[PDB]
Design a protein around this ligand. Structure first.
Ligand SMILES: Nc1nc2c(ncn2[C@@H]2O[C@H](COP(=O)(O)OP(=O)(O)NP(=O)(O)O)[C@@H](O)[C@H]2O)c(=O)[nH]1
Ligand SMILES: [Mg+2]
Lengths: 204, 134
């Protein structure tokens, strides 16, 4: 079994949670609902050297939590520092987080992500980004709304963690599903209640 | 450079669980799972919906995967109980119930699939049903 501790940190609103909850459900949360001091979900990626599990500690952003987000950090093996790009403020703070991290757990692979690069009115210009260079941190433009590069972060890390610079994500074993027979009332009812659904307009 | 933490895992006879079946149909579309937890319909995935019939067993299933990352987001076997009803007249998408296994855990999700065009939906409809005609 292959598992790694991943702590996702960064100013609230940056999309940290939306990012993870998309790699988990393939859903896109349009609404903002602040994470109450870290939430953990696991993410699995099938690679050529087998599958790997990422234990993601989706932490909070509101400083009102500044305290506790140190225990969240203990024994973490890698982190994704994320900022909005559509809100320069976020980028400004970046250096702060990078510090909090290297405080409890020095070195350790870290990816810097400028999420939301899908929105036109971009504010944190490309040439603006520099911290990743001065701090030696892999950076990538992301877009939890367009999946844009949303795997590169984990992939990059995976490699670092394992040791195979060429390790690569590759489809996913489409294992055989379960067997469910009998129609009677069974499927006859499955019909009625299904009305409730299709009577709910479709997104987009 | 970061020294590796976990001992190097040997490569793998990279499966795919695909094969042993043949694409009775294969078009890209967008998938939706209902929530109930609320009432909103949720985006489940974007990629290719396939319709595979086992070469041997002959069991036709509906496997959908997501592009870029490639992860199943549909895995159930097509059944004669399943009825692809339209959806708000949307002649480009349908909804059906299925004890899907996309997460490798059986869950009875109500689904919705939407296609770029109607021709594509129509073909999906046909082929889907043609796979029930067996
Ligand atoms: N268009 C667009 N919207 C995005 C993107 N990523 C996420 N969102 C939006 O970001 C908003 C807030 O992000 P969310 O993930 O909820 O916040 P967070 O980054 O987790 N902050 P915290 O957990 O600390 O409270 C949501 O309304 C969601 O629609 C993106 O790439 N672009
Ligand atoms: Mg949040």
């Amino acid at each position: 079994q292959v598992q790694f501790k991943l702590v996702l940190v960064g100013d609230g609103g940056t999309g940290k949670t939306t990012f993870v909850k998309r790699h988990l459900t393939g859903e896109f949360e349009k609404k903002y609902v602040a994470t109450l001091g870290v939430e953990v979900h696991p993410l699995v990626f099938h690679t050529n050297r087998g599958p790997i599990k990422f234990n993601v500690w989706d932490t909070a952003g509101q400083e009102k939590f500044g305290g506790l987000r140190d225990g969240y950090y203990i024994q973490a093996q890698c982190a994704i520092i994320m900022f909005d790009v559509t809100s320069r403020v976020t980028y400004k703070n970046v250096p702060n987080w990078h510090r909090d991290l290297v405080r409890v757990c020095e070195n350790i692979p870290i990816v810097l992500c400028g999420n939301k690069v899908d929105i036109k009115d971009r504010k944190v210009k490309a040439k603006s980004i520099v911290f990743h260079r001065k701090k030696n941190l892999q950076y990538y433009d992301i877009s939890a709304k367009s999946n844009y590069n949303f795997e590169k972060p984990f992939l990059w890390l995976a490699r670092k963690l394992i040791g195979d610079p060429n390790l690569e994500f590759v489809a996913m074993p489409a294992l055989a599903p379960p067997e469910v027979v009998m129609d009677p009332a069974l499927a006859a009812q499955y019909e009625h209640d299904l009305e409730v659904a299709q009577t709910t307009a479709l997104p987009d | 450079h970061f020294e590796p933490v976990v001992p190097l895992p040997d490569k793998i006879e990279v499966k795919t669980g695909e094969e042993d079946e043949e694409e009775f149909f294969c078009n890209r579309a967008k998938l939706f799972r209902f929530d109930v937890e609320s009432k909103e319909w949720k985006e489940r995935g974007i990629g290719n919906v396939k319709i595979l019939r086992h070469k041997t067993s002959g069991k036709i299933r509906l496997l959908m995967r997501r592009e870029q990352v490639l992860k199943i987001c549909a895995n159930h076997y097509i059944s004669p109980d399943m009825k692809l009803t339209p959806n708000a007249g949307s002649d480009r998408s349908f909804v059906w119930h299925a004890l899907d296994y996309a997460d490798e855990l059986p869950k009875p999700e109500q689904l919705a699939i939407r296609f770029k065009t109607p021709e594509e939906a129509a073909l999906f409809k046909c082929k889907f049903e043609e796979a029930q005609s067996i």
